[PDB]
């Protein structure tokens, strides 16, 4: 493992394609918003 | 006082008109600081 | 009573008392290094020891693995109720001598 400071965890993001298993995380994970850590910031719809 | 700002050497209260001069009215000495704001400010000691 | 202080770890328990691992949220050595001293001298109790998982996180893991006969939780229940009585005595004998001075 590498302990990572959350303050670079807020701004360093990983892409995820939400499909069928992820919703009740992710549909929740958005409502946190980018300020609090366990959350998301950018979002991209399938409509490209 | 409550007015705007100060000389360097004169250390004198100086209020300036909009685009008036950069000089200090009293001394010929030029540079001027800006005096402390009367507005409240908050620190947390810890 | 708030239901978050002790959480019995599902992962380290076995069955029928014996082993168990309790994590006590919001604590530090101040308690464990005492509580275990009462626990270890309980005749049955065998393995009782604590550690902090990581200081930047606040948790106290404590481990009780005893013989058969009485139970994991029953141990910590008892011994804790004993660590009560100590402090009760320290106050008793102490505040008495200080009053007489």
């Amino acid at each position: 493992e590498v302990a990572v400071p959350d303050r670079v965890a807020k701004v360093l993001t990983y892409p995820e394609k939400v499909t069928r298993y992820n919703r009740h995380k992710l549909q929740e994970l958005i409502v946190n918003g980018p300020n609090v850590h366990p959350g998301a910031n950018y979002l991209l719809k399938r409509n490209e | 006082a409550t007015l705007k700002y100060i000389c360097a050497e004169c250390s004198s209260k100086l209020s300036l008109s909009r685009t008036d001069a950069v000089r200090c009215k009293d001394c010929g000495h030029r540079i001027l600081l800006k005096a402390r704001t009367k507005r409240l400010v908050q620190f947390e000691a810890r | 009573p708030d239901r978050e202080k002790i959480k019995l770890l599902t992962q380290a328990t076995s069955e029928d008392g014996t082993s168990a691992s309790f994590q006590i949220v919001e604590e530090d050595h101040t308690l464990g290094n005492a509580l275990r001293y009462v626990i270890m001298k309980n005749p049955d109790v065998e393995f009782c020891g604590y550690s902090i998982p990581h200081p930047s996180e606040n948790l106290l893991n404590i481990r009780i693995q005893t013989y058969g006969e009485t139970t994991a939780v029953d141990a910590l229940q008892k011994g804790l109720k004993d660590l009560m009585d100590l402090c009760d005595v320290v106050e008793s004998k102490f505040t008495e001598k200080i009053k007489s001075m």
């Binding site: - | 409240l40 000691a45 | 002790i6 290094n33 001298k41 004993d82």
Partner: protein, 335 residues
């Protein structure tokens, strides 16, 4: 092992408590009480107002060390935290100086307050009995009396040295009559919060809350609370003669002492000694003297910030750990 720690020249020995039933073949010395109560004792050396030094005998290391830790933190106290500046011109940082008031102790007894609540911001946080507000303002002017040039920078000016004495108290509704007999005073009155020269002025009112030790040292009710573990010097052979006289100079003065040249050096007393283990470096004293400290006997000294009497400190420090244990008992174990 006979509760006497080994002292050597290169090490110590025999540290662990080892009182518990189950390390021996014959398991005795198992808990209960009475076996404890009718054993355990306590003594005292001296009590001043802001300091106490007393003695605690025949309990193990652990729960004592608990009292040290929990004492230097968990007994709550009250110290200035938030600071509001009405301007400031001081040469001292408008940043730092705030930090200073944050630290200075205060003589007021807790239990006169209730814990601040995290939520409900602003007007619902700091409320009446929830906070002791402190007010300070001082301006410096050239003293019209000026005996001579460049003399002591006190006569030259007014109040150029601000002292913790300067912090006043501002009561409020219900706030006056409750402390009327116990008006808050800034602990040790004389402290340098700031130095400043005329033309400079500081006006600030700082809210003072009820904090907890481990969060910041400025909440520690105790300057220094620790326990020296009682030394035991014990000798073999009379070791008398001349060099016995050297033997006492080997230790710090009080220590042991010569009774007679024939009566050698009896041990006058322990607990004056720093356990500085010189007799071991001098060789020839080697075989006839060994050093020890007894795990049961805790010399225990506690300072105070002036917050309250240390007898009170050590006292409450217990009932914390107790109350904590019980609060753990009555919380059922979730699965």
């Amino acid at each position: 092992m006979s509760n006497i720690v080994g002292i050597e020249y290169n090490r110590v020995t025999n540290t662990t408590s080892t009182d518990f039933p189950g390390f021996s073949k014959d398991a005795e010395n198992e808990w209960n009480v009475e076996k404890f109560k009718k054993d355990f004792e306590v003594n005292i050396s001296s009590l001043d107002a802001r300091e106490a030094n007393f003695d605690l005998i025949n309990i193990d290391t652990s729960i004592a060390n608990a009292f040290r830790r929990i004492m230097i933190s968990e007994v709550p106290s009250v110290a200035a935290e938030y600071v509001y500046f009405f301007n400031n011109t001081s040469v001292i940082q408008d940043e730092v100086l705030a930090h200073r008031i944050g630290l200075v102790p205060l003589k007021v007894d807790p239990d006169m307050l209730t814990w601040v609540d995290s939520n409900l911001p602003d007007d619902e946080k700091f409320t009446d009995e929830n906070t002791i507000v402190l007010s300070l303002n001082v301006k410096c002017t050239r003293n019209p009396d000026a005996p001579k040039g460049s003399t002591d920078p006190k006569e030259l000016y007014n109040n150029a040295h601000v002292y913790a004495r300067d912090l006043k108290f501002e009561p409020q509704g219900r706030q006056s009559t409750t402390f009327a007999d116990c008006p808050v005073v800034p602990a040790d009155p004389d402290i340098l919060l700031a130095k400043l020269r005329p033309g400079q002025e500081i006006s600030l009112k700082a809210h003072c809350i009820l904090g907890i030790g481990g969060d910041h040292a400025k909440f520690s009710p105790v300057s220094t609370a620790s326990y020296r573990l009682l030394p035991q010097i014990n000798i073999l052979q009379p070791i008398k003669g001349e060099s016995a006289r050297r033997f006492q100079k080997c230790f710090p003065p009080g220590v042991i002492g010569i009774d007679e040249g024939s009566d050698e050096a009896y041990v006058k007393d322990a607990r004056k000694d720093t356990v500085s283990r010189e007799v071991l470096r001098y060789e020839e004293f080697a075989d006839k003297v060994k050093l020890g400290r007894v795990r049961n006997h805790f010399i225990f000294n506690v300072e105070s910030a002036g917050a309250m009497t240390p007898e009170e400190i050590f006292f409450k420090s217990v009932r914390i750990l107790k109350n904590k244990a019980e609060y753990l008992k009555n919380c059922p174990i979730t699965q």
